[PDB]
Amino acid sequence: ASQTITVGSWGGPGGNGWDEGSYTGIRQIELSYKEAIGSFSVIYDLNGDPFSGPKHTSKLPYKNVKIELKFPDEFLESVSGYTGPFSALATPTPVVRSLTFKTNKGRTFGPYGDEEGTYFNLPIENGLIVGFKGRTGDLLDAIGIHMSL
Amino acid sequence: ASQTITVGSWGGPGGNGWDEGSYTGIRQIELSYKEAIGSFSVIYDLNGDPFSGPKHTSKLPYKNVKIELKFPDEFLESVSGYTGPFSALATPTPVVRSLTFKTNKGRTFGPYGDEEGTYFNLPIENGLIVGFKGRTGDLLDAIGIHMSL
Amino acid sequence: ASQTITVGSWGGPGGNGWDEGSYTGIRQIELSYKEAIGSFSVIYDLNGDPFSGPKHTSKLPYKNVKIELKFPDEFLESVSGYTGPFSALATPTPVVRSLTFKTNKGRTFGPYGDEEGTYFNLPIENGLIVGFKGRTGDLLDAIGIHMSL
Amino acid sequence: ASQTITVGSWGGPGGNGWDEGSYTGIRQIELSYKEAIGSFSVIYDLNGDPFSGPKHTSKLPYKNVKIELKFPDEFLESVSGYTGPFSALATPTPVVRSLTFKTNKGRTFGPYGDEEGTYFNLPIENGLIVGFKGRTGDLLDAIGIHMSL
Structure with a gap:
C-alpha cells in the first residue's frame, strides 16, 4: 500500500x-x-486507540459542532446532504451546502448547512465507513469515502 | 458464507x-x-466464464435495451437514477423511475426511464459492482448494489 | 475482474x-x-446453491474419500499435509503425499496418503477458504489456497 | 470495528x-x-507516513538485525521459519526457533535463529501482510500475520 473501496x-x-x-x-x-x-x-480509531485525522479547517466564522459516535457499538449507516454554489462567498464552483449523518443506533446528527442544492445520499446495508476523501478551499468543497468490512 | 460490502x-x-x-x-x-x-x-462473469443471474421481469410492454460491456477492460464507474412514485400503475410507493450507467472507458448508456423525482448518484474511484440486489413487483421498485476490489 | 487473497x-x-x-x-x-x-x-457453494468445480482426476487406481461439511455452520479452519518426491511415480519433482483437513466444529479428516516429506501448515484465525488452485499431472503435484471474509 | 484476514x-x-x-x-x-x-x-506504514507499532522486546542478549524494505515497490512475498521447544530457556513449550523473510524484489533476509524443529511456510501469490500478531514472554513464542488487498 493496501487499498480500500473508495465510493463517491x-x-x-x-x-x-x-x-x-x-x-x-x-x-x-x-x-x-x-x-x-x-x-x-x-x-x-486506530487499532483500539484514537487517531486525530488531519484537519480541513475554514476561515469563515461559522456555527460549530462535535458529533461523538459511541465507538465499537455505534457506526454511521447513512451519509446524505445537498451540494451547490453559494453566491455570497462569490465562489462560482459547486460546494457542500449541507451534510446530515444517520447512525445504526438510531441517533441522526441533524442537518448542518441549508438543505438547498442537489441531494446526495449513501445508505450502507453492509459495510464500514473507514476514512474520508474530499477537497477544501474556503469551505469544504467536495466529500468522498473509504469502505471496508 | 463469504460476504461483500452491500451499498445502497x-x-x-x-x-x-x-x-x-x-x-x-x-x-x-x-x-x-x-x-x-x-x-x-x-x-x-463467474471465474472467466459467463454466468446468467436470475431474471427480474415485468409483464409491462416496455422498450428494451441490451447493455453489453467489453468484459476484463470495461466496467461501470457510476450508477445514477430518480426514484419517485408512479400514479399510472396506481403505485403510491416510490419506484426507480430512471437509470443511467457510465463506463470506465468513457461510454454512458444514456438515461432510460424519465428523469423525474429524487436523483441518486454513486460514483466509484476504486471498487467493483460484483452482484445486484433489488425489489420487483410490476416495476423495478428498488435497486441495491454489492462491491469488491 | 475482482481479485481475492491467494496464499499457497x-x-x-x-x-x-x-x-x-x-x-x-x-x-x-x-x-x-x-x-x-x-x-x-x-x-x-455459489450463492446458496451448490456448484461443481472441474474434476482434477488422477489415472492412478487409488483409494477414494468424500469429505462433506455441514455448510454455513461448518467450515474449514485448517488445511495441512506433507510434500516430497515419489520414487515410484519416477517423479523427479516433489508432489503432495498426505493432506489432513481440520473443521471449526472439531471434525478432522485423517491424513489421506502418507505423512512423508517436508510438512506445510495453514491455520486460519479469521478468513474463509473460498476456492482451490493447484497443479495436477498423474498425482496432485501441488495445491493452492484462495481466501476472503 | 473493521477486520482483516489473520492467518496462523x-x-x-x-x-x-x-x-x-x-x-x-x-x-x-x-x-x-x-x-x-x-x-x-x-x-x-500508515497512509503514507511511518507509524511505529508497539515494541515486543526480550532481555536475552541476542544478535540484532534491522530489516528495511523499500516500501512501495518492495513488500514481503513469503514468511517461513521452524517451530520447536528450546531446552536452555528451561522451557517445556514450543518457541519460534528460526525465521526467514523473502521479498518480491529478490532479496531474501536469510535465517535468523537455528533451522531446528517443525517447519512452517506462508508463501503469498496475491495480497499484503498488513500487520503482525503473536506471543512474547522471554523470547518470541508465536507469530501470526494479517492480510489485505
Whole structure:
C-alpha cells in the first residue's frame, strides 16, 4: 500500500484535494457550518486507540459542532446532504451546502448547512465507513469515502 | 458464507425482495423501460466464464435495451437514477423511475426511464459492482448494489 | 475482474496448472490416495446453491474419500499435509503425499496418503477458504489456497 | 470495528499474546536472535507516513538485525521459519526457533535463529501482510500475520 473501496466524491471542482486515508473506524466528527459546511476534521480509531485525522479547517466564522459516535457499538449507516454554489462567498464552483449523518443506533446528527442544492445520499446495508476523501478551499468543497468490512 | 460490502438501497418498499449474490464481474445488463424501469436482469462473469443471474421481469410492454460491456477492460464507474412514485400503475410507493450507467472507458448508456423525482448518484474511484440486489413487483421498485476490489 | 487473497503454491513445479476459481464457500471436497494424493475435485457453494468445480482426476487406481461439511455452520479452519518426491511415480519433482483437513466444529479428516516429506501448515484465525488452485499431472503435484471474509 | 484476514499462529501457547493490529504496509522489521528469535518490533506504514507499532522486546542478549524494505515497490512475498521447544530457556513449550523473510524484489533476509524443529511456510501469490500478531514472554513464542488487498 493496501487499498480500500473508495465510493463517491460528492461536491464540486475547486478547493484543494485532501485524502486522509484509511483506519479501523470513526470515533468523533467535528465540523463548522452556517449556510454551507466550512471545517471538517475527524478523530479516527486506530487499532483500539484514537487517531486525530488531519484537519480541513475554514476561515469563515461559522456555527460549530462535535458529533461523538459511541465507538465499537455505534457506526454511521447513512451519509446524505445537498451540494451547490453559494453566491455570497462569490465562489462560482459547486460546494457542500449541507451534510446530515444517520447512525445504526438510531441517533441522526441533524442537518448542518441549508438543505438547498442537489441531494446526495449513501445508505450502507453492509459495510464500514473507514476514512474520508474530499477537497477544501474556503469551505469544504467536495466529500468522498473509504469502505471496508 | 463469504460476504461483500452491500451499498445502497435506493427505491421504495413495494415489490418482492430479490438478491442475486456476488460474482467476479459484470458482462451484460438487460433492462426494459418506459416512464419507469420494468425488467432488470444481469449476465455475470463467474471465474472467466459467463454466468446468467436470475431474471427480474415485468409483464409491462416496455422498450428494451441490451447493455453489453467489453468484459476484463470495461466496467461501470457510476450508477445514477430518480426514484419517485408512479400514479399510472396506481403505485403510491416510490419506484426507480430512471437509470443511467457510465463506463470506465468513457461510454454512458444514456438515461432510460424519465428523469423525474429524487436523483441518486454513486460514483466509484476504486471498487467493483460484483452482484445486484433489488425489489420487483410490476416495476423495478428498488435497486441495491454489492462491491469488491 | 475482482481479485481475492491467494496464499499457497505448496508442492512442486511439475504437472499442469489448474485454478478452480473463487466462490461463496465449500460444501464437499472429493479426493483419492494410496502412498500420495492423486485426484482432488470439490463441490462449491455459489450463492446458496451448490456448484461443481472441474474434476482434477488422477489415472492412478487409488483409494477414494468424500469429505462433506455441514455448510454455513461448518467450515474449514485448517488445511495441512506433507510434500516430497515419489520414487515410484519416477517423479523427479516433489508432489503432495498426505493432506489432513481440520473443521471449526472439531471434525478432522485423517491424513489421506502418507505423512512423508517436508510438512506445510495453514491455520486460519479469521478468513474463509473460498476456492482451490493447484497443479495436477498423474498425482496432485501441488495445491493452492484462495481466501476472503 | 473493521477486520482483516489473520492467518496462523505458528508457535507454542506460552507467554503473553499480543496483536499490533492492521495498517497500510510494512516498512521495517527489527528483531534479535541467537538460537531462537527474542525481540520483534515493526515500523509500519500508515497512509503514507511511518507509524511505529508497539515494541515486543526480550532481555536475552541476542544478535540484532534491522530489516528495511523499500516500501512501495518492495513488500514481503513469503514468511517461513521452524517451530520447536528450546531446552536452555528451561522451557517445556514450543518457541519460534528460526525465521526467514523473502521479498518480491529478490532479496531474501536469510535465517535468523537455528533451522531446528517443525517447519512452517506462508508463501503469498496475491495480497499484503498488513500487520503482525503473536506471543512474547522471554523470547518470541508465536507469530501470526494479517492480510489485505
